[PDB]
Design a protein around this ligand. Structure first.
Ligand SMILES: *[C@@H]1O[C@H](CO)[C@@H](O[C@@H]2O[C@H](CO)[C@@H](O[C@H]3O[C@H](CO)[C@@H](O)[C@H](O)[C@@H]3O)[C@H](O)[C@H]2NC(C)=O)[C@H](O)[C@H]1NC(C)=O
Ligand SMILES: *[C@@H]1O[C@H](CO)[C@@H](O[C@@H]2O[C@H](CO)[C@@H](O[C@H]3O[C@H](CO)[C@@H](O)[C@H](O)[C@@H]3O)[C@H](O)[C@H]2NC(C)=O)[C@H](O)[C@H]1NC(C)=O
Ligand SMILES: *[C@@H]1O[C@H](CO)[C@@H](O)[C@H](O)[C@H]1NC(C)=O
Ligand SMILES: *[C@@H]1O[C@H](CO)[C@@H](O)[C@H](O)[C@H]1NC(C)=O
Ligand SMILES: *[C@@H]1O[C@H](CO)[C@@H](O)[C@H](O)[C@H]1NC(C)=O
Ligand SMILES: *[C@@H]1O[C@H](CO)[C@@H](O)[C@H](O)[C@H]1NC(C)=O
Lengths: 49, 35, 35
């Protein structure tokens, strides 16, 4: 529901499709890659699970 | 391609300062017909 | 100083819109000489 904010302080809600863009920005990949490949990425995650 | 995009305007910085020069240029043309 | 540099051209984001402005300005002079 809240990314990493709940472990640091007050819990702040954030959309998951934006939290994953933040993670991609964390790993050094620009965020538009997610917004252009969201469906494929979701399929990969479900297949991996 | 992006899901959830919204509609809004994007203000761009170069256009207003160049619009100052554009108004200046229009004024210069208008004054240039005066003589 | 740098070893292995190569030769190529570099594009600049201000030249094209100021070139459109220069073309507009030249067109404005051309129209202004008509009367
Ligand atoms: C934000 O602005 C966008 C650009 O004006 C706008 O897109 C426009 O949406 C309308 C209706 O969805 C389109 O109208 C056309 O609709 C169909 C094609 O789906 C045609 O058969 C019609 O004849 C009509 O031409 C516009 O073409 C479209 N504009 C562009 C440039 O694609 C968005 O809808 C705006 N945001 C929101 C939330 O509405
Ligand atoms: C990319 O562009 C560079 C600039 O035009 C170019 O540098 C030029 O290289 C030539 C040959 O190396 C020089 O020609 C001169 O060569 C000797 C000096 O080594 C002089 O005695 C000659 O009389 C002659 O003038 C150019 O002077 C030099 N240009 C500049 C501005 O320094 C690069 O060579 C280009 N890249 C590649 C891969 O060729
Ligand atoms: C959010 O969910 C509502 C329904 O719960 C839906 O109508 C809306 O389009 C969704 N927004 C986006 C950006 O998907
Ligand atoms: C108009 O041009 C004349 C010289 O041609 C100059 O003296 C005057 O100050 C100019 N006025 C404006 C408003 O630019
Ligand atoms: C790479 O090596 C080749 C020979 O192995 C040499 O001719 C070339 O100049 C080298 N390139 C650079 C950028 O040092
Ligand atoms: C030229 O200037 C006149 C001003 O009298 C204007 O009516 C006309 O539209 C202009 N033409 C162009 C091509 O800018």
């Amino acid at each position: 529901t809240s990314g990493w904010t709940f472990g640091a302080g007050p819990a702040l809600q954030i959309p998951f499709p934006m939290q994953m863009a933040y993670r991609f920005n964390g790993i050094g990949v620009t965020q538009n890659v997610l917004y252009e490949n969201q469906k494929l990425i979701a399929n990969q995650f479900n297949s991996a699970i | 391609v992006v899901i959830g995009i919204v509609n809004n305007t994007v203000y761009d910085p170069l256009q207003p300062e160049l619009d100052s020069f554009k108004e200046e240029l229009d004024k210069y043309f208008k004054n240039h017909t005066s003589p």
